[PDB]
Amino acid sequence: ERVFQISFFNLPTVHRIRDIRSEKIGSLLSISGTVTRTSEVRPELYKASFTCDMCRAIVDNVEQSFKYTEPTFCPNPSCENRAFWTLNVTRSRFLDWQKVRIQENANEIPTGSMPRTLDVILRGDSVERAKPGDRCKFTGVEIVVPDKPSSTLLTYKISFLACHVISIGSDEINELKEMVKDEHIYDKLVRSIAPAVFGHEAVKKGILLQMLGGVHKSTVEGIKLRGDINICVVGDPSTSKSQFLKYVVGFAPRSVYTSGKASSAAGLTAAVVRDEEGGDYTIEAGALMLADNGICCIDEFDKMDISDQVAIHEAMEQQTISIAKAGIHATLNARTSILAAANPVGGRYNRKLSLRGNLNMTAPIMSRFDLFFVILDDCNEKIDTELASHIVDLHMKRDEAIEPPFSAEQLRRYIKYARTFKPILTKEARSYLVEKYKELRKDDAQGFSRSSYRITVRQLESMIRLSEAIARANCVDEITPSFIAEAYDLLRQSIIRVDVDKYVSMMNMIVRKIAEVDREGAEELTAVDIVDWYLLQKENDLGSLAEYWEERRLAFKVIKRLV
Amino acid sequence: KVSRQITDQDLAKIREVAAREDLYSLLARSIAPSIYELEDVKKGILLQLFGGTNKTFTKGGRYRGDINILLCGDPSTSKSQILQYVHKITPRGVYTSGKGSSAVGLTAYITRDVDTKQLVLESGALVLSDGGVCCIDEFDKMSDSTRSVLHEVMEQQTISIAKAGIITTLNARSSILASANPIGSRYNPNLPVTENIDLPPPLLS
Amino acid sequence: PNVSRTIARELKSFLLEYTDETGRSVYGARIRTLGEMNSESLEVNYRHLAESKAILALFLAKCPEEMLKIFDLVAMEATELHYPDYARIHSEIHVRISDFPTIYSLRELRESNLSSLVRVTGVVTRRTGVFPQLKYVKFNCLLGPFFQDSNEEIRVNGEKTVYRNYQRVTLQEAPGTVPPGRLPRHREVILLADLVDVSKPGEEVEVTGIYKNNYDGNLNAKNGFPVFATIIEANSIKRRVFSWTEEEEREFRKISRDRGIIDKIISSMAPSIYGHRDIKTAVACSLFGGVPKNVNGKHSIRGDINVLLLGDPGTAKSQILKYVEKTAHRAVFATGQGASAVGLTASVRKDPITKEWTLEGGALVLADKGVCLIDEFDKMNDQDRTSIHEAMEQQSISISKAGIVTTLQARCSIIAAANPNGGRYNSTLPLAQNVSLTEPILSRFDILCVVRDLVDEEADERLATFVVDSHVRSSPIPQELLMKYIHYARTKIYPKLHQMDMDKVSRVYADLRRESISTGSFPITVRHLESILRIAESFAKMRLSEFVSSYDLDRAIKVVVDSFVDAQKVSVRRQLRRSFAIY
DNA sequence: TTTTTTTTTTTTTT
């Protein structure tokens, strides 16, 4: 019950595939490069029991040669085989193995080249540890393989093996206790995130809060609720919002990022690739695959158009995406935040634009990403000199020595710690979140062309999924009224960034005409003019000629009611 | 053998050329011996091969030295001559036309090895340019999937290939010069500039 | 060893007279079951083996292979005491062996897992038909009888040889459960006897069987080294499992006796949802299916329900559809288009090398007797949408490609979810102004589900207090029960109306259509009328009345009413006052 | 005692 496997590492020097020569045979060597086509693992004979050999020799050992046949060699005595082996499989101990062909890396290879590459076989428990696309340190063992010479009583080639492979190519919570003491690490975690960006404030938070997880769980029975969080940041190009995005990929784990129109469609969707060839239906990932459980990023929704808009929105509700070309029936685990930034369809604000018509996209995918968090970037003279101050300090190669209060990597390990929390407010002061959410829609109630949306029933779930991450921020669980208050108002800005029964229609517009106009003007002149712009917007949503006339004689009848 | 380690004594011949006053003009006039006037072009293109410096920070950064430059004017300016020239001087050069460019065209064709029957990742015209200088014709005339590899490397300064068997998002960093023409091809006197440059001013930003 | 005969002596004890949950051995009940079911497939709980002796259970980790060989041979005996027969019936039964974790997935497998019992699971993929295996060699004499083979038979004969089923099945791990970056490495799995052909292409399933390798095998030149290929033969198979039994069902009818069970299943269908009791009615209504039903030897009409759910942003809509999957025994989730696998075309592809064209079923084929679910009709091309309109008419699919005349059978009910043109509420004008989809494909659907709204105050305090109460986890029928429920009734109960009280719906349909002229058109058809009975028959199946009571209609009718009524524009102010008598 | 095989038709797809 013992078979021991040797591995040697930290080898003298990395050698190229172009460096591969016959001298290296039977010798240790370090090489690294990209995977191609990992093949399924199938056992190594090592030793076998095969016998008899005519008729039972039961001889069990060795036969470890590379064929691997056969036993039956020089048995028993007296069995005199020759004969059958006969193969005895059960006593044979097996191990591993899979063939993985490595490709030579692009950065080193001298274009035009077309890198010439051979197989790395994984013999040893070091098998399977590899992942496609990565470069990895290997152990040499040049040797050779059978399919120019022939053994007269053949053809050979390079077979690369490694007895050892690495994928290259504690007390810091005591740092974290020190960090989880302060009140101030809440604002600290904020000014410490992206130095490459200046100002923009609240939006920063969400980014963090995006890397931070939500509940993304329960409550049965039934569907998994969200969970997650989502942000589409917008503003006039030159905004320097993209500086956020490279910060996503340049900070966050397993970050997938593409802005392009061309994915294409599938894309985050599967292709499906046909012909493979040979029976085909080969299912592309595509795109978002390793993106699963990660922060996905896009630019310029104008430049992904409308075709795929809701097809990447499958994961924005179901959180998983099935994919149909008339391929084979499938569904895919997508669970991810999707953050992005389109440039506004006017290129600017478009103050007046309700953000709904601001985006050039549909509420199902729009209402779902919460929340957008508008930033318009403008000139201001001081600010022109402050952009000429700090943005300059970024322009600066030096001083680039200005630093955040948090070392970036310690912020990451703080997250990897903050990713452990599963904070839950069961607390009865979530009653306050009701009133809040109630008063969240009491205002958006009119106009329905306002921030509404509604705002969406999902924005209650969103209201929750905000304080989910607020908790990981403050590291305590069960949250609080203050915590959600943060997030609620925090929505409230970017919903305000969207801002710029006979007599129930009459007392509607009696105080509504003044609601849109008595703040922006006098609410004066005559009584019947208030009727005349109303014969404009009344006729279009009324459902008869009779419902037109009670939009007439009632706009008469309430006038002589209040006159 | 064929159809560069620097010697020491011409290095102080370099600094000798450095004390020479007109090296900013001089080398430029040595850039394009074929072309008359347009000295701001030789000027710029001089500074193109000297373009920028690497900022690696602690992390992120990598704004590089990379500089794109557009040029255009009256049709056939001898722009294609400076492209066809500078293209050849370069350690890694790149050149193509408008309408001869698209998204699918310049990155990772990932074709089969053919004769050995094995799919092997191929570098597209953009991966090889990584470092050095690209060149193209008439950005007004580029297709819609064209610019989709551009929106991709201008800032990302990388390229993302996850498809088929193997996944790599690999870097591309190089300065670039595309020749072009106004829509006219005369851009006509007066007029607002943006439309006259074709394209929206957001894309030109 | 012969000492294992003594093992065989005790396992019999665990195998037959063992009892669980206050007597009533699962054994005697199943033996008796088939038995009466004579399906010669016996199923064994590992729940029990661990509890009693964990030494027989570790025997599954050494060599389960032959352990079962005598094991089932005892069950036979144990079954024989119960049924002194089967000498004339099958004369052999092998046990199924329910779940034994393990709980390994796919790609992680080691040679240490060979010859020892292993549970596996994954999604069904391209499969062969059934070829009978040879088993025991036997002839007229004529050398003698030989065993064979799993599978060698080395190192010529036979006549009366006892044949058995054999089917080889390539199964691949779910693209959904696929770890990222990876290609779908896959496994070959053998099926025998009752286990044969049970599984069906494209579904998640459990394969219980042990691993085989041997031998060389044939790869060789692709390796250069000894490699014994991966094959796994399943001692049993279970889909991603549930079926009713005698006791559950006998209690289950005791639910069916009470008046308001129909009412109960209403509040049960949206357990975490709340939302509107309005729609769920039509949801479990559709979900319950209906009588086929044939008029000899002609058209079978339709017993299957066509759901159209109009959408609205932020409405529960996309959340409700997916309840039906883990609800339904059988379903296919297609989303809308863009799309979700598959695009619902039934295609035909020529197989590798030299073979003529194999026919791949449209996901509907996967969904037969079940229900197909779609959302977001704004996102469907006019290309893949065509064939939708087909299935709900013929209850089948007929495609184009290429070289083979065929027909199929599609019994799929259909749940339509689609977001309104543009944003929230679209036609203050007639709702015909709402849908982008053509009316021919619209009226095809029997239940027109409208959702809302422009904000109301109190109802959201209602739903959302309920919501912040829902998320707190981190009258409804128990959910195990209601799936067992609708399914139980869908394999059995077959409702019929009597013409006596049902002329009333000819006259009252006259009432439901004469002024369906009064405002707009249509979205009625004569199919629309046809569907009403299909709505009632379902509730009858929930009441398990076996034939339609008058009230069973009142359900259906009342549904149809406001299914049409708020679907009408504000002019529906009048349309209310007419359909009153249809209350 | 084993030998030896890539176009043409159609398809589903951005």
Ligand SMILES: Nc1ncnc2c1ncn2[C@@H]1O[C@H](COP(=O)(O)OP(=O)(O)NP(=O)(O)O)[C@@H](O)[C@H]1O
């Ligand atoms: N009773 C309820 N009413 C409304 N929303 C609910 C209810 N219960 C839960 N929700 C939540 O509200 C969300 C709204 O989902 P839904 O409106 O269907 O997304 P969607 O608008 O359909 N996206 P799309 O299908 O593209 O239009 C659900 O996913 C739940 O998280």
